[PDB]
Every structure is written in C-alpha cells, then in structure tokens.
C-alpha cells in the first residue's frame, strides 16, 4: 500500500482499555491522616469523562496498601490483547514517589512495575497512563504577578 | 556509519518505555484540592478531555491542563502559610508515539 | 459557579511554571554514551531537531527522540552487567503553551 | 481584530534566546570521576543544531561546581526582554536531581531556581528549557523483545 508512517499509537483495537480509578477518601485513624473532602467529585468526574472516551472504567474506594498492590497485580495479569491502552488514576494523600493506601504508603514504582514492558506482555508497545492527584512534597508556590 | 550500540538484529524496547505520568503538581510540591469542587488538577483534566479529546493529541491536551491550573487557581486559607499559593501540573512522558483518543 | 480558589483579581502564575526538562533517561536509571559518537540522547535530539524543528511542536519532536533512542540503541559491554541494556528518555513538561521554534 | 487563541508561546521576539552548553569532559582526579569520552561530539552537535534555530549559543567546558552556579546566576541576571526563550544543556556525570561539576555535585534545583518566574522577570511567561545528559541513578533496563 501507500507510505506508512507509524507516528501515533494504534488506538483502534476492539477496546480502548481499562481505566482503574483508586479513590481514597477515608483513612484509618491509626495513620493520623484526615479525609479528602471533595475527592468523590473527582472520582465521578473521571468516570464520566473516560466513559465517553470508551474506556472500561472500574472504580475502587478506600483501599489499603495491600489491596492497592493486589488490585494492580490482578489487573496487570489480565489479557489486554484486545485493548488499545491502559489508564490508572490515583486519588489520595502522597509524597514524592509515594501514594497512600488507607493504612500506609505504597511506592508508585511498585504499582507501575507490574506494567513494565516485560511483565505485562499484552500491553507491550501500548500506552500506559498513570494520572496522580497527590502531594509530591511540602513545598508551596508563592507564584508571581503577571 | 557503524557501531557497537545500534541496529541490533533482535529488536527490543526499554521495559520502561511507553509510560506517561500525569502529575497534578511539580516535584517536591503540595497538590491542592477544593473541599467542595474537587482537586484543581482533576477538575481541569476532565474539562480539557471533554473539550479536546476528539481534537488534540494527548500531550497538547495536558498542556492545556497545565495552563488552566496555573492561571485560574490560587489557594485560599485562613492560615497565612497556605494562603494565596499556586500550582503547576507536571507531565512526565516516556511515550514513543503520539496519542489520540480518537481514530 | 463561585469559589474561594479561582478568578483572582490579580493574575499570577506559578514560579515553577514554564519549565521543560528533557532528560536523557528515566528516573533512577543510568544514561548511555558512545565513547566515539556521543550520547544516545543528544545524538537523537539533534537529529530530530534538524529534521523536525521547522515542522513539529516541541513535545512531538521530543516524542520522536524518545522512540529513536528506545528502538535504535542497545549497549555493548565486555562486562555482562552492563551489556545489552536499553534506554528511554524522559520528557518532563511544566510548560503552559505549545512551543514551535518557527513562526 | 479577529479571534486570538494564544495556544503557543510567542517565539517572534527579536532574539530566540540563549543556549548555554555546559560540557564537562575532564574531572578533577580528587573526585575519582573518569573522563566522558565523546562528549565533545555532543557539544559540537548541539552548537550547530541550535545555531540553525537562531539561538545565541555559548559553550563552557570543564566547569567546577562553583563556576556552574556563577555562570547560571550571571546569565539569569541578564536582560532577556528581547529574547523569546532560554535553553541550557548540561552534559556531565550525574545522579537523580544532581549534575556534577568538575570538583563536585550541583543540585539541579539550585541551577533552575535562578530562572524561577519570580527571580528572572525577563523570562517570566517564556519557555525555559533544560536538556540534561546525565545519569539519574544506577538502574539498568534489560529491555524486552518486540
């Protein structure tokens, strides 16, 4: 056929893929963390937004660090052969390179490793998107007048 | 030209390739959330996706999100330490191709 | 709609806004350099700029760099520990607009 | 006039801006660092590339940590009013968030802070690009067969 360029990901597979939303609003008292008021609005906004993009949206609320790891491991072990991509949205308290489960921190690296090109073959060569709403430190931007 | 590190017979890609991290804030900074309307980042991300997903490449969509958050939002707090602060989302791309949600 | 954190009378932007970091490698990883031809990243960056600077937006140019490095390069070393390794550049954007080197 | 969108940076100022290249090839024996063979090829390639993009290219070789900081401070104090943007390329040994001068490390943050929106007003609202060729850790990517 004619000239083929291949500059954009193939997004015409039967399924756009999964959109896993981890919505952590309430944390165990033992952690000393406070609730994240307004996060349910984010979770609902995301579900509707990615729904219209044809993603298979799966929501999970208030997951412990163990459940987060189990969820990600399970999802990475699914057959993504007929899916164009993978999306995961994390809504919780956080620090640089860390996302908090309801009972403790989870290294972002541990979550993303399940999807490495060599560990999840049905996603190899496909876009794996991680959207993270969480702190990455304690610095504040005073901003500047424009 | 020829060398020891190119044109391998067996084609491979980095195991870290094809990942995109859309962070709500810059490295080392707090991320803001309105107790009623949700986080600045997610509000903005959803708004830009609904408005541009069928028109722009993903990186350009995320760039619109960066501008929306950076220009339209400023914190309000009874605690001067946390009052009148700003935020700038952080796009980290290790993608190898352009990404359009439509085809 | 109305709230405490938007539509400020005095317009401000984050002090961290409008920065773009084009890293040669992913966070936590080594970066490779050919003792004769130069680093994989810079070689690729210059090649893509010379070929696309007058045609593509900067993020799309950098995406081409990501693909070039990820697909075309693989390390060679007499030390098995450092042999046959791969690399993927890392684009970190806190820009608020599209960037074209031409006008 | 007609509809104005403002989706791209104004790049039609009289000058495209500066392109500062810091090329560190030889390091002080006291540091125990080895030379970076082939870096001169990168430095020359960059100069020619950005020259054709109309940038004011300034090269510096083998700078100590003090000189790197002084150079950046001096450059940030220049009047960039007539310049569309700013570019800085760093070629050296490195670690996460660090770039090595010939006699020691320099926090990337210290270099970039000089150009913060509030510290360099003539660049406020303009793109500040930092191109970094350096390690960010000691991990190796075994890659995966496509």
Curated annotation (Swiss-Prot), chains A, D:
PTM sites of type S-nitrosocysteine: 135
Active site residues according to the UniProt entry: 93, 135
Record's protein name: Caspase-3 subunit p17
Originating organism: Homo sapiens
Lineage: Eukaryota, Metazoa, Chordata, Craniata, Vertebrata
């Amino acid at each position: 056929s004619g000239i083929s360029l291949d500059n954009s990901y193939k997004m015409d597979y039967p399924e756009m893929g999964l959109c896993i939303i981890i919505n952590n609003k309430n944390f165990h008292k033992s952690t000393g963390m406070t609730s994240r008021s307004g996060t349910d609005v984010d979770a609902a906004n995301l579900r509707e937004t990615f729904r219209n993009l044809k993603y298979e949206v799966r929501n999970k609320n208030d997951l412990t660090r163990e459940e987060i790891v189990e969820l990600m491991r399970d999802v990475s072990k699914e057959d993504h052969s007929k899916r164009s991509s993978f999306v995961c949205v994390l809504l919780s308290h956080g620090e640089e390179g860390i996302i908090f489960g309801t009972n403790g921190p989870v290294d972002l690296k541990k979550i993303t490793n399940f999807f490495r090109g060599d560990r999840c073959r049905s996603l190899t060569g496909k876009p794996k998107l991680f959207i993270i709403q969480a702190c990455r430190g304690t610095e504040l931007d005073c901003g500047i007048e424009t | 030209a020829s060398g020891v590190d190119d044109d391998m017979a067996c084609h491979k890609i980095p195991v870290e390739a094809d990942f995109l991290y859309a962070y709500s804030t810059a490295p080392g900074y707090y991320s803001w959330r309105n107790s009623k309307d949700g986080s600045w980042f997610i509000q903005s991300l959803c708004a830009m996706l609904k408005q541009y997903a069928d028109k722009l490449e993903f990186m350009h969509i995320l760039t619109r999100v960066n501008r929306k958050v950076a220009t339209e939002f400023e914190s309000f707090s009874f605690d001067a330490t946390f009052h009148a602060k700003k935020q700038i989302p952080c796009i980290v791309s290790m993608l190898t191709k352009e990404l359009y949600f439509y085809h």
